[PDB]
């Protein structure tokens, strides 16, 4: 049971090794648009938080799950930020989420005061007062119920079928990362020019014993002019200086 679009889930993904090769055994995926990353290189990167949102939508609105879009899904049901670096996955589920005789359990909000902020979730059911007069909880003329149920008969065109959507959104940067792909570690060598990767930091240089002190909250002190100069192993906590 995916949740309906006005009240979407949000699974926070904690520490793991994340094989994305899976997620490639579910269907043809009517879509699959990775935005900040390219999907062929996901199994070799470290991310800090991977937020997975999940909902259902009609088929002609799958193009509205994108950064900076308009229409009655992206304005006020689910707003992606313009600083987006995730991946939008969407596949048809007319064989599961739609029954004969109307499926009145998928609803979308069509009237609101104004738009949402990015990643904003509302579960309000207060009657939007369009007209100048109050109608005090009794809908009708110039004040309507805000959550309208979808249709999802099976005999609807593609473009009115229930499409399930999972939006992955994850940021890679400060802090550790916690969750990273399967890269298979490797023996650490010292005093040799090598090609190194320290939990996401890709570079070249000679590794040497340092004399700097990162405090348990520090992961890699760059130098003046903003270039990485020291790192701390990802499973030993040894501080090592780097130099071209």
């Amino acid at each position, epitope marked *: 049971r995916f949740a309906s679009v006005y009240a979407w889930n949000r699974k926070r993904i904690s520490n793991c090794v994340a094989d994305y090769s899976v997620l490639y055994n579910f269907a043809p995926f009517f879509a699959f648009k990775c935005y900040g990353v390219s999907p062929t290189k996901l199994n070799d990167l470290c991310f800090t938080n991977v937020y997975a949102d999940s909902f259902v939508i009609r088929g002609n609105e799958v193009s509205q799950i994108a950064p900076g879009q308009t229409g009655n899904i992206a304005d006020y049901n689910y707003k992606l930020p313009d600083d987006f670096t995730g991946c939008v996955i969407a596949w048809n589920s007319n*064989k599961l989420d739609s029954k*004969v*005789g109307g499926n009145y359990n998928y609803r979308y909000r069509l009237f609101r005061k104004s738009n949402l902020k990015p990643f904003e979730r509302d579960i309000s059911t207060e009657i939007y007062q369009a007209g100048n007069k109050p109608c005090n909880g009794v809908a009708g003329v110039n004040c309507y119920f805000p959550l309208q149920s979808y249709g999802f*008969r099976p005999t*609807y065109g*593609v*473009g009115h079928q229930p499409y399930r959507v999972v939006v992955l959104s994850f940021e890679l940067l400060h802090a550790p990362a916690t969750v990273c792909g399967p890269k298979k570690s490797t023996n650490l060598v010292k005093n040799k020019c090598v090609n190194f990767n320290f939990n996401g930091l890709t570079g070249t240089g000679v590794l040497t014993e340092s004399n700097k002190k990162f405090l348990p909250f520090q992961q890699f002190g760059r130098d003046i002019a903003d270039t990485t100069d020291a790192v701390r192993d990802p499973q030993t906590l040894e501080i090592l200086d780097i130099t071209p």
Partner: antibody
Amino acid sequence: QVQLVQSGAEVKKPGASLKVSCRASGYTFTSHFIHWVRQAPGQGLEWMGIINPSGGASYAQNFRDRVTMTTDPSTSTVYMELGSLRSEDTAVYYCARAEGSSWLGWFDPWGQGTLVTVSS
Amino acid sequence: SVLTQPPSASGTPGQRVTIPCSGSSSNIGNNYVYWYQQLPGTAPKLLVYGNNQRPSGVPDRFSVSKSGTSASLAISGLRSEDEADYYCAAWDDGLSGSGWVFGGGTKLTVL
């Protein structure tokens, strides 16, 4: 031993309505959705509707706005009502039973067939 | 009518006749096919379904084939009961509508 029986029909003037029955027997009534299919003589077949035998229904969109269905899961019958008939709707209608789950499935029991016609 | 079937076919008892039905990705390239036999003056029955399975009450001399966006039915050794109309069935999801679409059928007989 499992059969879907109907009512014999007659000439009907155009613009009128037509309620036709489909009585199910021999098995569990609320276990199998019902297909309604139609065939004009000297032509192919085209299906009208699909019915939850205790629930709702859905329709083929080429034949929307003129067909209604009703379940009646006490004397084990479903019904098809077609109003504003025309002269090109002279055909024979079969009432088939489907597989126990949703729309995709085989159509194992079939109706005897009903003749629908218009004349003067 | 979106499906494509030959309008007629003929043969002799002892010959292998194939009846095809080719459609599209919406029609066939994404949803099993089913084969129904209409004998004149009766209701249709089952012949073959699911591209590998056959129901009861039928000799398995009838066979099913599927090549991409096409399917067909094969009959070796005709008899006098095989002068009938044959239809193939498939679900389809189209832009204008969706539903349970049929073939045109093929009338098969022996002179």
